[PDB]
Design an enzyme around this catalytic site. Structure first.
Site, mmCIF file in Angstrom:
data_model
loop_
_atom_site.group_PDB
_atom_site.id
_atom_site.type_symbol
_atom_site.label_atom_id
_atom_site.label_comp_id
_atom_site.label_asym_id
_atom_site.label_seq_id
_atom_site.Cartn_x
_atom_site.Cartn_y
_atom_site.Cartn_z
ATOM 1 N N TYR A 224 29.975 40.925 37.054
ATOM 2 C CA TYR A 224 30.013 41.858 38.171
ATOM 3 C C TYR A 224 30.133 43.289 37.656
ATOM 4 O O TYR A 224 31.065 43.618 36.914
ATOM 5 C CB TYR A 224 31.156 41.512 39.128
ATOM 6 C CG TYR A 224 32.530 41.963 38.684
ATOM 7 C CD1 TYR A 224 33.194 41.314 37.651
ATOM 8 C CD2 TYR A 224 33.171 43.020 39.313
ATOM 9 C CE1 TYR A 224 34.453 41.718 37.247
ATOM 10 C CE2 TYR A 224 34.425 43.435 38.912
ATOM 11 C CZ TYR A 224 35.063 42.778 37.882
ATOM 12 O OH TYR A 224 36.315 43.186 37.485
ATOM 13 N N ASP B 30 34.445 49.789 37.173
ATOM 14 C CA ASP B 30 34.587 48.571 36.393
ATOM 15 C C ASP B 30 33.216 47.946 36.199
ATOM 16 O O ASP B 30 32.403 47.910 37.126
ATOM 17 C CB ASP B 30 35.530 47.569 37.070
#
Lengths: 107, 259, 350
Positions: A26, A37
């Site tokens: 992800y 992130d």
């Protein structure tokens, strides 16, 4: 509100089911576009089992909607992901997130 | 410095207008910090606190032709440094989105330069003001106390800097008057997060005029991407292939989209 | 407030030497079509996504310098409002993504062919992926400068250009009114692929530093009394042109009159305005410009292959952009005219 824009077509043969671990890479970014992130940078697949509260509700719902080998633009409302309170220093309060996930395999 | 009867202002004065040595070249102005719209959108104390409309005024000094003064907003992705600049020469593009049946459901227009000609509006100084509403998504241009027919609509998330393009015409050229309309929160409130709910107009040292230098230094990358090209097909056309990956680490200035 | 830091991937844009631009008198069709197929693309070779974008760019504003550029870096074709393009799912212009619905609804993939459709008279750009048009199309773009196809790969791709109709068989039939890309190749130079504004070029002994490349703008494509003694000189030149027509057969009085009628254009050009060679070259250039203006008034426009029904002409270009053979023929005709003038005994000041 999970509106998955199908970035890459999925196989469609299998879909996540309770008790099966999900493997994704992800890549995440905020609404403004800045990256907060990216598991890809870690270079390790993120493994979580669906059904429990291990991950956020929006990610679990998107993974359930997504299929194997499918890349989707994951949009999450502040209600389903964090909200007024968030991770201090990373996610600003009441801010939406735009995840980019892809399912290598379902186990 | 801020006056009792005049809000704090920044003025531009030509050093050697009378002297023949000084140049009269084209010049562009851009304030240091941007104005950002909300990610998604829909004197009275209450209205002031909830006001989503901001105001800045620019005063063209007497003796300066309004025809050479172009006033508006600028997108950070602006690189036009034409010696002779006109609004018609501004790059612009309109995107139209339709359905399978051909019906046009959404149409939008985006450009890097949103300004109105001073000559288009019109020996006394004229003040040109711009009204921007963050939550409305559109802006109104009220100059010299009178509204103008022209107006623009912006994308949900975009950055905008105050900017005026003025050609040198007098010793005292132009003035940036940072002032608030009676029901309009001043630009300083939206300029910084801390003073968001401060009705008083203020000019912190960070805000300054940034002119457009033509050429700036840059560093050559040590390793460039290797690309191969050839006409590999009599009926397959030209083919290009690149195999070696390469990555570079860079920093982002949040004030202006740059790397 | 703080300076955020992250690593990106390098991007490079390549174009053919084709130049397409609109002007008042330029000999351009105003509508072109080309297709590009992707042989193989790796979805992810580096931590950041590899982006593949196909579109058009201006020759005066597109500056994709390898580096930070604008935004977050990796500036593609659509990073600046100067140029246009899309990634296969989102239209890209001015470093913003426009969600455009597509029947396929997937990124660019191997064995997938994408194409472009643009009109210069009417400012609209449309695209077709896998033979199906995109729901949303571009509009109202500036016509200044010259356009060209361009692709911005991200650190890895296997993609081949099929823009050249003669160079490569088209995967899909072009829509009506859209000329092939290879029809717009300039006669001066052969078709080739070169990076845009490549300031460094690799060399055998060592890297070669390249200065600012100079390219023609759209202005490049843009194209009174008869003295009586000059009339006698024109009669002498009519006899000379009858001799020239006899040579071209490989001197009747009506033939001389017809030759004078043909050369009346040169006579009027001389009436309007070594050194003799320079004046002859200037007169030939003016005559070729007049011929190009007449062709434009007839609706003629340059193409690689000349078609009479389509009014295409191989010489539908300005004298500066004209081939060397036409210039040599005009120089020979002007040298014959100079010989006739020398025989006449009257020479104008050069």
């Amino acid at each position: 509100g999970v509106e998955i824009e199908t970035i890459s077509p999925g196989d469609g043969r299998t879909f996540p089911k309770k008790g099966q671990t999900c493997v994704v890479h992800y890549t995440g970014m905020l609404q403004n576009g800045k990256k907060f992130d990216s598991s890809r940078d870690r270079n390790k697949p993120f493994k979580f089992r669906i059904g429990k509260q291990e991950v956020i509700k929006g990610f679990e719902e998107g993974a359930a909607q997504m299929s194997l080998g499918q890349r989707a633009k994951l949009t999450c409302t502040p209600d389903v992901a964090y909200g007024a309170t968030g991770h201090p220093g990373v996610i600003p309060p009441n801010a939406t997130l735009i995840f980019d996930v892809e399912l290598l395999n379902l186990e | 410095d801020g006056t009792v009867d005049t809000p704090p202002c920044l003025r531009l004065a030509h050093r050697t207008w009378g002297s023949q040595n000084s140049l009269v070249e084209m010049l562009f102005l851009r304030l240091s910090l941007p104005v950002q719209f909300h990610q998604h959108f829909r004197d009275d104390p209450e209205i002031i606190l909830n006001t989503t409309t901001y105001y800045y005024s620019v005063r063209v000094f007497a003796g300066q032709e309004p025809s050479c003064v172009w006033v508006g907003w600028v997108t950070p992705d602006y690189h036009q440094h034409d010696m002779n600049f006109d609004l018609s020469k501004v790059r612009a593009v309109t995107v139209t989105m339709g359905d399978e049946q051909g019906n046009v459901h959404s149409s939008l227009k985006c450009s890097n330069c949103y300004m109105v000609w001073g000559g288009d509006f019109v020996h006394t100084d004229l003040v040109i003001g711009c009204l921007v509403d963050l939550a409305t998504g559109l802006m109104t241009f009220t100059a010299n106390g009178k509204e103008s027919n022209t107006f623009f609509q912006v994308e949900p998330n975009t950055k905008l800097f105050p900017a005026v393009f003025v050609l040198p015409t007098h010793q005292n050229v132009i003035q940036f008057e940072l002032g608030k309309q009676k029901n309009i929160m001043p630009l300083s409130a939206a300029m910084f997060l801390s003073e968001r709910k401060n009705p008083a107009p203020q000019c912190p040292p960070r805000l300054e005029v940034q002119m457009l230098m033509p050429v700036s230094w840059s560093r050559m990358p040590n390793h460039f991407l290797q690309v191969e090209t050839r006409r590999a097909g009599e009926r397959l056309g030209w083919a290009v292939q690149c195999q070696d990956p390469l990555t570079m680490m860079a920093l982002h200035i949040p004030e202006e989209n740059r790397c | 407030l703080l300076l955020q830091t992250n690593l990106i991937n390098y991007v490079t844009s390549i174009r053919p030497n084709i130049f397409v631009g609109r002007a008042e008198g330029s000999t351009q069709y105003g509508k072109w079509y080309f297709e590009v197929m992707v042989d193989e693309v790796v979805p992810f070779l580096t931590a950041q996504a590899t982006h593949l974008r196909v579109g058009w760019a201006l020759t005066e504003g597109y500056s994709p310098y390898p580096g930070g550029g604008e935004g977050w870096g990796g500036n593609g074709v659509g990073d600046d409002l100067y140029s246009y393009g899309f990634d296969g799912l989102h239209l890209w212009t001015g470093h913003v993504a426009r969600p455009v619905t597509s029947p396929g609804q997937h990124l660019l993939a191997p064995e997938d062919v994408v194409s472009c459709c643009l009109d210069l008279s009417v400012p609209s750009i449309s695209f077709r992926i896998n033979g199906c048009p995109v729901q949303g199309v571009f509009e109202a773009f500036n016509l200044d400068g010259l356009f060209f196809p361009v692709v911005s790969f991200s650190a890895g791709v296997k993609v081949r250009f099929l823009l050249g109709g003669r160079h490569g068989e088209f995967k899909f039939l072009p829509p009506p009114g859209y000329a092939p890309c290879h029809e717009a190749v300039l006669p001066r130079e052969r078709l080739r692929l070169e990076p845009i504004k490549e300031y460094r070029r690799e060399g055998p002994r060592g890297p070669h530093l390249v200065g600012p490349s100079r390219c023609l703008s759209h202005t490049d494509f843009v194209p009174i009394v008869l003295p009586p003694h000059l009339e006698r000189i024109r009669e002498k030149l009519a006899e000379n042109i009858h001799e020239l027509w006899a040579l071209t057969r490989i001197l009747p009085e009506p033939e001389r009159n017809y030759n004078l009628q043909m050369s009346g254009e040169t006579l009027k050009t001389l009436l309007a305005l070594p050194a003799q060679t320079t004046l002859v070259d200037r007169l030939a250039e003016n005559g070729h410009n007049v011929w190009a203006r007449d062709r434009v008034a007839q609706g003629w426009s340059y193409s690689a292959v000349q078609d009479i029904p389509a009014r295409r002409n191989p010489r539908l270009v300005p004298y500066r952009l004209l081939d060397e053979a036409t210039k040599r023929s005009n120089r020979d005709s002007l040298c014959q005219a100079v010989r006739t003038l020398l025989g006449y005994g009257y020479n104008i000041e050069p």
